[PDB]
């Protein structure tokens, strides 16, 4: 019933809308979508996905302004500027700002000014701004908060397990790296870009992009402040990524143990949020995994007793789209 | 000595500059570049390339608005509106319109309305702009033609051997299909595009797409008007494409005789524009081919006496660009 609207029907805007469709009984009720694109140019874009296959559900547009998922009409608007969005006139409590265009209050705010009570920035926030990872601190969120920030997919994965590790071995310093599928910000072939790297041909390159997901951890876990860091590696993959975490710790430990901690947190505080894989798998095997972080047991290394390396796979699009569908229940149910 | 300026430093834009650069005794002296970006993007992308390699030449900037290649400086302007271009002071003679947006007198004209004398649209002109294909009809260019087109990459390949075939056997009516590399116009991942098919991830699909090559041929080869049609299929390859043609001819023939003809033409009138490869080569091997069209002799077939099937290769960026440099020389040789 908590009327929901998706601004920025991109990879997420469309992925999210699908997780929701599959939710057992969500409290959210998506009624509007706002994309720079077209209406039918969105109804089709939904029904057919190259990464998720065919969206099981009657997706026929209804009129020249709405669609009709399984019968549920879902108005479709198109306006670049947020401030002009029919949120007030439509009655929207929650807006899924999955455009990555408006990331701060100033920007995202244009949504509230248009009539949006509480917004959700599906991406790292800009400057000062409340960040919460579903499963590490989706509690610190007070309804007093009008604008959230579900962090980045690299973080929403590189956190649920950074927690298990600092509070059980005590992370001292530490670095990370994420071999991530390329995404929309990279050009298909060599074009110009403000950054001379995402500019290079995607599918034919290993591109090193600067990320925040590291220091980004020092938010949903105050503790790790000033400790975590590292870089990102873009590669010829359409979906599913993997983080290579390496932190030095105090409490002496061995590779094997490190894996039990995780297996524990697996069915407790991180049940459905973190999982452990004892199989020899590859990226494509984790497509559509609801776990914002899945550890690969067979890879954990422990050099020098403390310095530990763990590997986690994460479906950057679908996995993340799940945590986002949740940081929305954390709002809808915990709604004032 | 005609001064040149390149509008749109994209694939064709940079590929064009590199082609010209290696030319011995050219009548062209290019000294200007325009694109939404500045000396930054430019200097870098003319030097590094995921398809052509590292451009072997000193590529460094000069001023915070120009660059230098093996000495010669070249202003690097950055205005998205052609009308406002310094073409009148830089004594700009020919403009290489390759932004893929200004393709009608309506547009390209702006380049003249800015000081330039001629425009060469590296694409089919929209409407009724004189279209030329070197080796086929570019000799039919006339100086009092301000805006002209060099046709598409597909048409430049197709025209040359369709010419021979008509000349030696007589095309009655044919069909074509070009399995083409993906271009900038395609989406890296299922995003919005005016065309639903071109909207789907380029590096992961076989993308059916419309072409006006079969028709555009009739422009440069008048006897082919109304005789050809055909589609395109974008595939997960970054460069080099292939056109599969099937015609019904008047003179009964056999595969061997067709290949013979193409070779005769390859060594005479189409010397340097048409080639016949007698080796079991694949796409990558055709990278950087100065030929507009190169036949796969082995692949040529003749069914039922008059239904001929020919398969030609071509490098859509480098190949085309070499022809654009050529057209430009023609222009510069009949200047008035």
């Amino acid at each position: 019933k908590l009327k929901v609207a998706i601004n920025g029907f991109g990879r997420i805007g469309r992925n999210f809308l699908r997780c929701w469709h599959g939710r057992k009984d969500s409290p959210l009720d998506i009624i509007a979508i706002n994309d720079t694109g077209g209406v039918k140019q969105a109804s089709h874009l939904l029904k057919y996905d190259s990464t998720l296959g065919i969206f099981d559900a009657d997706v026929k547009p209804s009129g020249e302004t709405a669609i009709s998922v399984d019968g549920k009409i879902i108005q479709v608007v198109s306006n670049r500027n947020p401030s002009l969005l029919p949120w007030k006139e439509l009655g929207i409590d929650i807006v899924i700002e999955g455009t990555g265009v408006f990331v701060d209050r100033e920007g995202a705010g244009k949504h509230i000014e248009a009539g949006a009570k509480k917004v959700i920035i599906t991406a790292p926030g800009k400057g000062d701004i409340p960040t919460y990872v579903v499963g590490v601190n989706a509690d610190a969120y007070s309804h007093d908060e009008p604008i959230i920030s579900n962090a980045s997919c690299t973080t929403n994965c590189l956190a649920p397990f950074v927690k298990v590790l600092d509070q059980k071995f005590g992370i001292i310093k530490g670095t990370m790296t994420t071999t991530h599928s390329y995404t929309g910000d990279q050009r298909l072939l060599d074009a110009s870009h403000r950054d001379l790297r995402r500019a290079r041909a995607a599918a034919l390159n290993i591109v090193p992009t600067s990320t925040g997901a590291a220091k980004a951890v020092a938010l949903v876990l105050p503790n790790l402040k000033g400790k975590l860091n590292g870089i990102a590696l873009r590669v010829p993959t359409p979906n599913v990524s993997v983080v290579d975490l390496v932190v030095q710790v105090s409490k002496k430990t061995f590779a094997e143990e490190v894996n039990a901690a995780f297996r524990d947190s697996a069915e407790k505080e991180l049940k459905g949020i973190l999982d452990v894989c004892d199989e020899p798998l590859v990226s494509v095997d984790f497509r559509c995994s609801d776990f914002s972080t899945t550890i690969d047991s067979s890879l954990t290394m422990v050099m020098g007793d403390d310095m530990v390396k763990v590997i986690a796979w994460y479906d950057n699009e679908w996995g993340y789209s799940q945590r986002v569908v949740d940081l929305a229940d954390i709002v809808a149910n915990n709604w004032k | 000595k005609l001064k040149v300026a390149i509008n749109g430093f994209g694939r064709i834009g940079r590929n064009f500059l590199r082609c010209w650069h290696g030319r011995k005794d050219s009548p062209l002296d290019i000294i200007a570049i325009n694109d939404t970006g500045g000396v930054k993007q430019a200097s870098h992308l003319l030097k590094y390339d995921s398809t052509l390699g590292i451009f072997d030449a000193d590529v460094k900037p000069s001023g915070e608005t120009a660059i230098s290649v093996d000495g010669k400086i070249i202003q690097v302007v950055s205005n998205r509106n052609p009308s406002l271009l310094p073409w009148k002071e830089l004594g700009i003679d020919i403009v290489i319109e390759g932004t893929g947006v200004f393709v009608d007198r309506e547009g390209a004209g702006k380049h003249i309305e800015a000081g330039a004398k001629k425009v060469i649209i590296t694409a089919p002109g929209k409407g009724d702009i004189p279209t030329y294909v070197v080796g086929v009809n570019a000799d039919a260019y006339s100086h009092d033609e301000p805006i002209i087109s060099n046709a598409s990459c597909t048409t430049n390949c197709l025209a040359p051997f369709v010419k021979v075939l008509d000349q030696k056997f007589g095309i009655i009516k044919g069909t074509m299909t070009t399995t083409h590399s993906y271009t900038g116009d395609q989406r890296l991942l299922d995003a919005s595009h005016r065309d639903l098919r071109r909207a789907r991830a380029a590096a992961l699909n076989i993308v059916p797409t419309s072409t006006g090559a079969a028709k555009a041929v009739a422009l440069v080869l008048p006897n082919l008007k109304g005789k050809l049609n055909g589609i395109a299929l974008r595939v997960p390859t970054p460069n080099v494409s292939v056109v599969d043609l099937v015609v019904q001819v008047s003179k009964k023939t056999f595969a061997e005789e067709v290949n013979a003809a193409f070779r005769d033409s390859a060594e005479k009138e189409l010397k340097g524009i048409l080639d016949v490869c007698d080796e079991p080569l694949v796409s990558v091997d055709f990278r950087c081919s100065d030929f507009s069209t190169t036949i796969d002799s082995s692949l040529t077939m003749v069914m039922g006496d008059d239904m001929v099937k020919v398969i030609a290769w071509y490098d859509n960026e480098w190949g085309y660009s070499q022809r654009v440099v050529d057209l430009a020389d023609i222009v510069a040789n009949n200047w008035k």
Partner: peptide, 22 residues
């Protein structure tokens, strides 16, 4: 300041400006 960055300010959702962190 370079041209591309200014353009980006106003047209962030462009192809030549999009910058997703992770």
């Amino acid at each position: 300041s370079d041209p591309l960055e200014e353009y980006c300010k106003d047209n962030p959702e462009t192809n030549e400006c999009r910058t997703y962190d992770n």
